[PDB]
Each structure stands twice: as C-alpha cells, then as structure tokens.
Ligand binder design. Structure first.
Ligand SMILES: CC(=O)Nc1ccc(OS(=O)(=O)[C@@H]2C[C@@H]3O[C@H]2C(c2ccc(O)cc2)=C3c2ccc(O)cc2)cc1
Ligand SMILES: CC(=O)Nc1ccc(OS(=O)(=O)[C@@H]2C[C@@H]3O[C@H]2C(c2ccc(O)cc2)=C3c2ccc(O)cc2)cc1
Lengths: 9, 240, 240, 10
C-alpha cells in the first residue's frame, strides 16, 4: 500500500 | 476525536490554515519529440496527475480534522475523492481562461485537444462548464479551499461510528466558515444560504465528472495505452 | 413563470400534492433473473408516475421539451434511489422497494455488484434516519435533483436564459428548505448546517446513481433480462 | 420520437 507510507511521511 | 484542533479553530483561522495548506501548481512535461496523439496526451496527463497526487496527500494532512482520523479512514477518503480533488483544482485555475482548461501553466488545452481520446471531449465540456459556472458566480479563493476540503471529508464518509460524527462535526465547521465568508463579503442573509446551496450543488456535478472519469481511467489501464504508476494503480483499484 | 411567485408554504403544498404513490411489486407467483425481473418491472411503472410528477414540479413545465427530456434522462435513477431511501427509513438494515418487496443484503448478494450499492443505499437511509428527515424536506430534495442533476450538461442567449430560470427555481427551493427549518425552530446556524448536510447527501446519491447506471447498461448488453422500451431509452441516454 | 418526449408532450 503506497498510500500508507506517503501519509506517514 | 473530541480534542480536534479543527473544532477549536475560528472561521478566520480555518481560512488561514486552508490557504497555507494549498498545494503548489505544477508544470507539465514538455517533450517536443512526442507526437500529438492519444498515447502521448494520456502520458502527459498521467504524469502530471501522478505528481499532483503526492502534493495532495500532504495537503490532506494539513486539512483541519483530517489528522484526527485513523490511517485507514484517511486512506478511504483520499482513494474516493482524489479525482474529484484534481478536477476542482483544475476547474479553479482554469477560471482565468474561458473555453480552455489550464492543466498546467505550460499546458492550456481547449475543447478540441481531447478529441483523439474517446470520451475526453465530453468530460472537457463538463469541466469547462463547471469553470464557467465558478466564474459566473465569482468564486473566491477562500470559498475554493472550503469546497475542496468538503470534497475530501464528504465523498467517502458514507461508504465506510464516532469517527463518522467527527467528520460531520468538522463539515459543520466548514459550513460555518463558508457562511462567515459570505457575510463578511456583504451578502444578505438570504443570498448567503442560496449561495451555499449553489456551491454545494456543484459538488454533485464534480462527483458525476469523477465517476465518469474513473470509468475511462480504468479502461485506459485495461488497454495498455500508457504505463500507470503504482500509486495511480492503487487509486484506480479502489474504485473497482 | 408562476413558480417564482409561490410562497414557501405554496411550494411545499404543490410538491406534496404531486407526490407519486408507493407502488407494489408482483408477489410470489427467487433467482437472480427473477429479482431483476421484479425490480425492472417495478422501476418501469415508477417511471410513468415520475414523468407526470415532474410536470407538477413548479418551474419544470416552463422549460422546453428537450430540456425537460434531458433533466429526466439524467436524474431518473437518482429520483428512484432517493425515493427508495426515504421509504426505507423506518426499516433499519432493509430496503423497502415496495410494501411487499422487503430486501436487504441477503438478496443483494445474488446479483453481481448489487450488494455494494445496497450498502450505500442503506447508509443513506441510516443517515436520513439519524437526521430525522421530514416529508417536506424530502420533496424539496427530490425536486432539487430533477432540476440540478442535468443543468450543467445543457448546450445561446435563449439557452442561457433557460439555464438561468432553472437556477431561479433552485434558489426558490433553497428558500423553501430554509423556511421549513426556521419553522421547525432551528437557529440560524442550525439552518445553514442542516441545509449543507442535506445537499451533500445528494453527491452520494449521484455517486450511487452512476455506480448503478454502470451495471444497468451491462445488463442491457447481456440481453438476459428484458427491459421495456422506456428503460432502454433511459439507459442509452447515459451511455451517450 | 423518444417515448419520454412522447410522454412529456401529452
Ligand atoms: C480511455 C479513453 O479512451 N478515454 C479517456 C481517457 C481518460 C479520460 O480522463 S478524463 O476523465 O478526461 C480526466 C479529467 C482530466 O482529464 C483527464 C485527467 C487525467 C487524470 C488522470 C490521469 O491518469 C489521466 C488524465 C484529468 C486531470 C488531470 C490532472 C488534473 O489536475 C486534473 C484533471 C477520459 C477519457
Ligand atoms: C449482475 C447485475 O445485473 N448487477 C446489477 C444490476 C443492477 C444494479 O443496479 S442497482 O444499482 O443495484 C439498482 C438500484 C436499486 O436496485 C437496483 C434497482 C433497479 C432499478 C432499475 C432496474 O431496471 C433494475 C433494478 C433499484 C431500484 C429500483 C426501483 C427503485 O424505485 C429504486 C431502486 C446493480 C447491479
């Protein structure tokens, strides 16, 4: 899930 | 959450936070070697939307009340609203260019340019019609950021319940801000609730444009017209 | 146009009298083709009542035939859906397609892609229930859908005056919704907030309509379920 | 020609 790590960064 | 900063903010603090969270206007690729075709057009548009998505994600995190949601709920709203959000931003910056869509400062297309792609002209007309409607209403910047945040919070709140009540509580605050903006602008109490309605009714058409656009973006994937980024692939898979 | 001259109570009074009846389904003479048969027959008879209901919506008969045809072609499934959601409010977890056709997720799962739309309709009905939606507010929302859902897809100074008349009737319905909330005892702030909550739900009704229209047009291609002549023409309007 | 136009005109 790319959208997951983009939200944490 | 009950300790949300969005609920503690005034109308002027709501406007200021939204204005400072505004994403940057990006440029398009300008490779002159590529011909004017469906594959190169969709490649330009795909690349621009890919880069805009990364900035939208940062913008969403600066929308008041959004950080208070769970990671899973945050994912749901972005997956549901991302094309709506790209579309309303395109419509906003195309206001100063009648009859044309300003995808980027170096990419200003009109109704005719999308005719090498089936269904693109129809959607361009809908986007152009929305831009002219925003112009006829003299849509202000402070109203734009409120509407775009409404899209982010509302578009998926019914397809996933104290978090439900938190989103609706933040949406009620954005309603207050919209009214405060119109009252401060000097509209009568009658003109206020009428303009609120007119702005919110346009959100239904933005949803309609997104649903039709998502259907085309999915067929494009299933036709191998252009390569799709892995992030855009997950955004599309959320709708099918 | 006499619609502009009506009062708030006259607007409500006119719309309430125009309400179509709640029709019945053909009962117990269940396969996927049999439930799709009941739903198609039911929706088919509702269309005839909806058409005559539209002629009683103030301001609608002041449009050209082609503009009247266009508005119905675009909104008909939204109008059927908000009707279903309204009469299903008193049945939590249930969709009251008809007094003798009470369905929930247990039947939606035997038709591909239908249980997803069932969940969205139930969430909408759950939402109207939590908001305590009133009959007077319901007839206003349904009229808003009819006039708004296709207003930005029209195609002159004459056509611009017709688009402008639709926005005049829409402002009249907005004033009517506010008068209803003001008469109910809500503060000025609660009026604006509730007006916003009701109008945002229309975006979700548009979303459910587009999601449902996509399956209904694939059902025509399969040619397994026979749809009447009127339904095939309503479907061809969205595919075109 | 459309049935809808037929039904709306009546
Ligand atoms: C498949 C086919 O034959 N045709 C067809 C293809 C695509 C269609 O997308 S759009 O809905 O026009 C869609 C709306 C706008 O044009 C297209 C596009 C897009 C979006 C994502 C993407 O990956 C590619 C283009 C847009 C857009 C891009 C950036 C932005 O800030 C605002 C809007 C429509 C029809
Ligand atoms: C495999 C397959 O055919 N699937 C599938 C088919 C249709 C789908 O449409 S609905 O959105 O569920 C669609 C919404 C609701 O269930 C379906 C239906 C309908 C409408 C017309 C029609 O001719 C058939 C059904 C309904 C409806 C009927 C009357 C009414 O007052 C309000 C709603 C969805 C999925």
């Amino acid at each position: 899930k790319i959208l997951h790590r983009l939200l944490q960064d | 959450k009950k300790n949300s900063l969005a609920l503690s903010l005034t109308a002027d603090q709501m406007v200021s936070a939204l204005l400072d969270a505004e994403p940057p206007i990006l440029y398009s690729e300008y490779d002159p070697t590529r011909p004017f075709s469906e594959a190169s057009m969709m490649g330009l548009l795909t690349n621009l939307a890919d880069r805009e998505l990364v900035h939208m994600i940062n913008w969403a995190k600066r929308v008041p009340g959004f950080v208070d949601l769970t990671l899973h709920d945050q994912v749901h709203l972005l997956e549901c609203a991302w094309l709506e959000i790209l579309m309303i931003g395109l419509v906003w910056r195309s206001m100063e260019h009648p009859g044309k869509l300003l995808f980027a400062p170096n990419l200003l297309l009109d109704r005719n340019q999308g005719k090498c792609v089936e269904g693109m002209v129809e959607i361009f007309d809908m986007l152009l019609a929305t831009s002219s409607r925003f112009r006829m209403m003299n849509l202000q910047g402070e109203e734009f950021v409120c509407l775009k945040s409404i899209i982010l919070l509302n578009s998926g709140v019914y397809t996933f319940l104290e978090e439900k009540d938190h989103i609706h509580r933040v949406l009620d605050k954005i309603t207050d801000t919209l009214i405060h903006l119109m009252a401060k602008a000097g509209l009568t109490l009658q003109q206020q609730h009428q303009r609120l309605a007119q702005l919110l009714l346009i959100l239904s058409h933005i949803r309609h444009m997104s649903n039709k656009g998502m259907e085309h973006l999915y067929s494009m994937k299933c036709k191998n017209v252009v390569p799709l980024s892995d992030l855009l692939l997950e955004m599309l898979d959320a709708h099918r």
